[model samples]
Target: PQITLWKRPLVTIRIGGQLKEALLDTGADDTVIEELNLPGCWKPKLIGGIGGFIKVRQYDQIPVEIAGHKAIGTVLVGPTPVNIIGRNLLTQIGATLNFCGGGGPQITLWKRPLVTIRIGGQLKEALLDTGADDTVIEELNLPGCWKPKLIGGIXGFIKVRQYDQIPVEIAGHKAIGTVLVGPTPVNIIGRNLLTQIGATLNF
Candidate 1:
């Protein structure tokens, strides 16, 4: 099976007796959905992500269909920013994340979909982050000048140096746009890069 990159990494699925679009999130640990009333009782709890903790209701043995594939498991409904098919469900769906020990980040990151990109004639592995509003790369001596600015990631807002009009290449798609450079723990390719190319992910 193969999956392509999406600007938003969205998939239409039928779950909780309704049609919904969920973000294919490899950064999350559990499936989080907008608070929906379902049959039976659910244990209310909290789940934490990079930003912080969010309230959710856990319903076990709920039927969910992703890309027309049926799967039954725990479903969390609460004040989620967006509907997400987390690694908990992503693993069950058998979507393979291409990670072959990229040299940039030595520490083990959770299930992150990887892609190769060329910046300034240098190739690097970047994590596909749909949640990110902008592409943030590791500190580089790129040709362009940058200024310290407040940039937001999944966790929250952080100060970083911003670079403008940098060319980034991904799998034959080339995009020249704003790129932030600073002490980024991992290189991330965001919607800014995917917005240009015609890429789609199939289940």
Candidate 2:
């Protein structure tokens, strides 16, 4: 299969009374934020990354409203450049990123559709991506009842274990799949769930 990176327009994120413009990247598995601007109540937690467990801090549980859909969760406070919209957020909402309809070359500045995810029995907005294989949940802390599962990647299965998948609804769609539920609150819409939704991302 031909692998391509999808870059969409930046979406406006408002948290802790702060509004910032962030790029919507589908290739990323997590929603990263600037640690310096994180809210105090988000809380901090150490999570296992590609290398090992890093001392990542969590902050307040903010209400995230995307494309009109809203979700409430804690977020990770990091120095990463962009906040990615991973699969976890996309599967719940029956939404798709339609790059094929954009009138241009295959790699031109692509236009994407607004995705909505149903989180916690509510509809949450999101963006769809083609580059990511797994769904990532942003800055929220998952409860212990949610068991973690082994994740398979290009390097085989990673050592990390994720719990249950969050129930999400999008564009009048719904599905239940495994997600890497963690201390951070942000959620992602990845490829695994996106394919199940009958949607694909083109770059």
Candidate 3:
């Protein structure tokens, strides 16, 4: 008989104006910034979904540090079960969620080799997301890609209210995935290309 075990760097997020600690969740889809901790610069907006339209506040941009790497991007303010480190933040660091190599544990998290993306002739950090089904990107004061494309989700096929697929580079690896191009700024590395990366999620 054989026993399997795995270990990963524990990640945490600090609320901008508060003293709350949020555990980083590699499996979640979006970065969730608690509405209660939102800064003044955050603007409110309407988010529509299966539950109809709900007014969600938006942040201008929040600083995030994970595994010693840092980046800033606008986040949506909402009521979450707990603070989660979603694909928006993880994709920037080329991190992947894996469960297969952990012997038999439920889930495991690992970082991909540091990946860089080229924008305006400059390189920025990014992550390869195995859990996300699309790609996303973000920056300061720029018009991003926004074209509604209906696609399948973990639940089922549904029209993405609004989004855009943009070209980006992951270190030397080049690929593209859909980004939520709108008032918010942040990129996600989705599953389409993540599957090719050959990463497995534990749970």
Best by lDDT: 1
Candidate 2 lDDT by residue in tens digits, 7-105:
334567666666666544444444456655644555566653322444446654556554444555555666443454443333322333442233321
lDDT of 1 by residue, 101-126 (tens): 22122212245667789998889998
List per-prediction Cα lDDT, in the order shown: 0.69, 0.48, 0.47
Instruction: Please list the residue runs of candidate 3 whose C-alpha ends up more than 4 Å from where it truly belongs after superposition.
Output: 1-10, 17-19, 46-54, 102-203
**lDDT per residue (tens digit) for residues 34-106 in model 3:** 5576555777776432213445677756886654556576566776434556656766655545423433222
Residue 16 lDDT in candidate 1: 68
Error of 2 at 29 (Å): 4.1
Best by TM-score: 1
* Model 2 misplaced stretches (Cα beyond 4 Å): 1-7, 37-40, 46-54, 88-203
